[PDB]
Design a protein around this nucleic acid. Structure first.
Ligand SMILES: [Mg+2]
Ligand SMILES: [Mg+2]
Lengths: 83, 149, 129, 83, 185
RNA sequence: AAGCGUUUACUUUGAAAAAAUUAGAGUGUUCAAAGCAGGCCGCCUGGAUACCGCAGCUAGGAAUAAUGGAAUAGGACCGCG
């Protein structure tokens, strides 16, 4: 197509674009609240944690790093947050 | 492209447009930096000080919560290293490779790499000397590099 | 690497214009490119344009018409007097009626005709016709 | 084309593509001059008026002629605004 | 009198009206502790779109963050006093001239004209944060800034958008339009 | 009105830069190449002007391109002993 609008893409085709190739840059990662089934405090964990995060008090461990998104241990509920 | 490789990669970090502290983050600037100081006392380069802050504490970029970057915080307190950490890791790597070569000498490929690490040191060494962070007499010696890890 | 950012804007505009596209995206934005594009508007060679403002060297979306033949940059930026201005437009412009040389002076970036009226030369940047 | 006296010296003013806005040459045998009928609003019958579009041969070879026709008609109300 | 004029002259009655319009607010409302250390520099009334007025309040930069901590509630309680006005807070910032060859230590980038205009705009709309910016350069040669605001805290500022364009036009001299994109945020 | 006040590169300006040659003004060597002569019934007159890179000197302009400032403050102004 010739008269393709470059100013206004729909969010469908803007989400699939590469993080650096968007109209304006925006990371694909996020933060989230991870609560152990045992304790009561909620910790903030990066999606791509890149480190082994464990809850304070030496109760259990929270996430295991991988090559992409970090994977959470069994039973740990998470909810992402916005601002 | 890479300085010493034929690859042309694109993987890198993308800062979001918004540069304000999030509303859910309650840790404040004055009590951010003393956590940085104690993590530096454990012994940690500023590269990995910020890594374990944005996954365990929710502080994305200290330059936004605090008024300055991590290395500026450390040096204003007096905990900056003797030599820059990026230059340090080149020297540590060159020592490891050079030690591998004395054990086995037919490793022609390993010898070829040693020029590439050493070339990167000298290119990086003259940069820091123009910025007056290393003394004008600072020279990289392969024999005595092992002592300073 | 990328040594000149104006050369990438003009070449990108020319590639899209020559293929009949309606909008083109200039990836790095600079004060020189924005000032060069406004000179391109006072004579109706392009439409209006946007400046997407991220916190880095921004982007630019230009509304293209079919009114452009070739925009080109001249590198390096030679210093040209007003005595030598006649020669330059005799080599890189199609005819004496149309086509403009965009050169930067102490009074700002401007075309060769309106630079001659205020009696001031400078450094050439490019042209269009 | 104009001279000092304001006379018209050019032999003929050539046509111009309605999609790319470039001169259609005298030997551009692939160029077309489309005619589209306009109908009455209440009834929908050919009145006798036309909305004329012209596409040069370069666009037709490029495979963009049909889209170019569609947007021109859409801007003229012939095609529905949402399409 | 909470007004401190930097040049040391008496403020006029209108902003002196603002002075005890806040001292009385200090002693009666829950702001016994917060307003004690705060201060006000200058105030002005602005003629804006239509037969409508608007008020802008200059605040010293060091205490600006403190005002934002109470800005939403303070203006509401200040609004129930001033009936048909819109009141917003902007810092008192200095624009040092660009150095020329005919003329003093280095000018920081904060005191530049570019870094002060966006600072003024970014603080003009406090409760909502800028999420994008576009500049439209029309055919006549003039510019037009388009500002994008987050959907969160949209119903708290939707009625103030006409005020924002009027205030920024008088402070700077820039044609500006505000919009709220559902696209991302 | 004396002087003072980041430095250049760049651009416009002004001076100074031998003639002859080249370009060019006037001028019927019978025309021309030339020459600097001639014209009017003692007088009227001409023997101009442009260019002369680069380097050096002078004053405006501040876009473009370098360079400098306050970051172990060994900082700028302001007054006191
Ligand atoms: Mg190389
Ligand atoms: Mg001579």
């Amino acid at each position: 197509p010739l008269a393709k609008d470059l100013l206004h893409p729909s969010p469908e085709e803007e989400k699939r674009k590469h993080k650096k190739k968007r109209l304006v840059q925006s990371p694909n990662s996020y933060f989230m609240d991870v609560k152990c089934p045992g304790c009561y405090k909620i910790t903030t964990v990066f999606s791509h944690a890149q480190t082994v995060v464990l809850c304070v008090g030496c109760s259990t461990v929270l996430c295991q790093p991988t090559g992409g998104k970090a994977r959470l241990t069994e039973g740990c509920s998470f909810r992402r947050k916005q601002h | 492209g890479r300085m010493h490789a034929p690859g042309k990669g694109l993987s890198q970090s993308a800062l979001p447009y918004r540069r304000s502290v999030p509303t859910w983050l309650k840790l404040t600037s004055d009590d951010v930096k003393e956590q940085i100081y104690k993590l530096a006392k454990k012994g940690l380069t500023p590269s990995q000080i910020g890594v374990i802050l944005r996954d365990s504490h929710g502080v994305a970029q200290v330059r936004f919560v605090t008024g300055n970057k991590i290395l500026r915080i450390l040096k204003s307190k007096g905990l900056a290293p003797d030599l820059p950490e990026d230059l340090y890791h080149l020297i540590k790597k060159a020592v490891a490779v050079r030690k591998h070569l004395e054990r086995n000498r037919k490793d022609k490929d390993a010898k070829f790499r040693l020029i590439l690490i050493e070339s990167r040191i000298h290119r990086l060494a003259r940069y820091y000397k123009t910025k007056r962070v290393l003394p004008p007499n600072w020279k990289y010696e392969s024999s005595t590099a092992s002592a300073l890890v | 690497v990328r040594m000149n950012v104006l050369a990438d804007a003009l070449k990108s505009i020319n590639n899209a214009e020559k293929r009949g596209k309606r909008q083109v995206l200039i990836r790095p934005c600079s004060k020189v490119i924005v000032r060069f594009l406004t000179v391109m508007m006072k004579h109706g060679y392009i439409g209006e344009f946007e400046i997407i403002d991220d916190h880095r060297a921004g982007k630019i979306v230009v509304n293209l018409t079919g009114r452009l033949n070739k925009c080109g940059v001249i590198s390096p930026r030679f210093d040209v007097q007003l005595k030598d201005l006649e020669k330059w437009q005799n080599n890189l412009l199609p005819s004496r009626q149309f086509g403009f040389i965009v050169l930067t002076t102490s009074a700002g970036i401007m075309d060769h005709e309106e630079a001659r009226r205020k009696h001031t030369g400078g450094k050439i940047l490019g042209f269009f016709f | 084309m104009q001279n000092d006296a304001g006379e018209f010296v050019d032999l003929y003013v050539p046509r111009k593509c309605s999609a790319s806005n470039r001169i259609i040459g005298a030997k551009d045998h692939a160029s077309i001059q489309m005619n589209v009928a306009e109908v009455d609003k209440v009834t929908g019958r050919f009145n006798g008026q036309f909305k004329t579009y012209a596409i040069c041969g370069a666009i037709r070879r490029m495979g963009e002629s049909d889209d170019s026709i569609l947007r021109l008609a859409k801007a003229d109300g012939i095609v529905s605004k949402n399409f | 009198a909470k007004i401190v004029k930097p040049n040391g002259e008496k403020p006029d009655e209108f902003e002196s009206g603002i002075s005890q319009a806040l001292l009385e607010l200090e002693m009666n409302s829950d702001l016994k502790a917060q307003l004690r250390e705060l201060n006000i520099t200058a105030a002005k009334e602005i003629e804006v779109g239509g037969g409508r007025k608007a008020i802008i309040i200059f605040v010293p930069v060091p205490q600006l963050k403190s005002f934002q901590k109470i800005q939403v509630r303070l203006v509401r309680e200040l609004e129930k006093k001033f009936s048909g006005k819109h009141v917003v807070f902007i810092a008192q910032r200095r624009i040092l001239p660009k150095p020329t060859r005919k003329s003093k230590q280095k000018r920081p980038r904060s005191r530049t004209l570019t870094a002060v205009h966006d600072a003024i705009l970014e603080d003009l709309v406090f409760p909502s944060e800028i999420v994008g910016k576009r500049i439209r350069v029309k055919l006549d040669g003039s510019r037009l800034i388009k500002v994008h605001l987050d959907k969160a805290q949209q119903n708290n500022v939707e009625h103030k958008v006409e005020t924002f364009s009027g205030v920024y036009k008088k402070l700077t001299g820039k044609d500006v339009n505000f919009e709220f994109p559902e696209f991302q945020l």
